[PDB]
Design a protein around this ligand. Sequence first.
Ligand SMILES: O[C@@H]1[C@@H](O)[C@H](O[C@@H]2CO[C@@H](O[C@@H]3CO[C@@H](O)[C@H](O)[C@H]3O)[C@H](O)[C@H]2O)OC[C@H]1O
Ligand SMILES: O[C@@H]1[C@@H](O)[C@H](O[C@@H]2CO[C@H](O)[C@H](O)[C@H]2O)OC[C@H]1O
Ligand SMILES: O[C@@H]1[C@@H](O)[C@H](O)OC[C@H]1O
Length: 302
Amino acid sequence: QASVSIDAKFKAHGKKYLGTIGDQYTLTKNTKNPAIIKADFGQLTPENSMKWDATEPNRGQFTFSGSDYLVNFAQSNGKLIRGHTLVWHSQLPGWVSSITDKNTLISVLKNHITTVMTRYKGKIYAWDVLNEIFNEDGSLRNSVFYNVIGEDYVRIAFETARSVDPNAKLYINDYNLDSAGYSKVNGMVSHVKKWLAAGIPIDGIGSQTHLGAGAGSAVAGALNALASAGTKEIAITELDIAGASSTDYVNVVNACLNQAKCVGITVWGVADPDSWRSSSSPLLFDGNYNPKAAYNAIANAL
Ligand SMILES: O[C@@H]1[C@@H](O)[C@H](O[C@@H]2CO[C@@H](O[C@@H]3CO[C@@H](O)[C@H](O)[C@H]3O)[C@H](O)[C@H]2O)OC[C@H]1O
Ligand SMILES: O[C@@H]1[C@@H](O)[C@H](O[C@@H]2CO[C@H](O)[C@H](O)[C@H]2O)OC[C@H]1O
Ligand SMILES: O[C@@H]1[C@@H](O)[C@H](O)OC[C@H]1O
């Protein structure tokens, strides 16, 4: 645990949280990891336990052991929770992607959203309802949901989520929304404006922010562009930067800090060894679960 909590310092500026991710393994693999989580971060996203493959491996049969644990740990230690993720083309069981009948897929979609959301009703701050539904050019990704249901699955998913747990912030999450003017950013903005105009309950836009070295400085403009979609809020949801330089990290923190709509930042992991991009050492803590320079830089920037 770092003496100074960047979450505490971020919240001091009116932000909701500066959090990270977890699940049974990382929360129990050693003493430092969970201790770092409770001391320096104020929100948790299950790294894998809430995905479709992990929650509904077979049609109508749910497995909630991993997610229950993550939720219970967060709830027991005062951490906000971002559910992740309800509708996604990846980590999706084959039984879903093989469905060809529109009404059957809609029924399955709704039951999955309903069951997973109902179990944690009232405990989730935000839900990444939809994940990565855009192609890089801004057009809709041809996943099973898009191909079988058509664009209406967007309305269906959000409306179902809204009715199931009206207390949660409903989000659409995606990566590569990292610089203003980028085709995917333009596509995210125009689509959300349209959906919001049609009455679709989209509360926020989540920008993953999986960056390479030196890309931190363009994030501020990206957030500014995303703010034009018209959602109540936006958030950096899965932040990690190859090289984890202070300049990049502080640039990204400032990007959120200076944009009214950005409610928080979630770093995709605590320490480098547990990163899904470990070879690039993209996190705030190192192989010894000790604060890296960027962590301190962030703290001194707040
Ligand atoms: O066997 C499973 C692993 O293969 C799997 O690894 C995770 C893959 O997803 C990573 O999280 C995503 C990163 O990219 C974005 O598109 C998503 O929104 C994130 O959810 C995660 O970091 C890897 O650990 O999951 C664990 C095993 O079940
Ligand atoms: O989850 C993956 C994404 O990671 C992938 O795009 C990645 C995102 O971050 C990666 O490190 C890299 O910068 C991008 O190419 O796109 C497919 C999606 O399922
Ligand atoms: O453990 C579960 C809890 O996490 C959920 O919120 O409510 C139902 C319980 O079974």
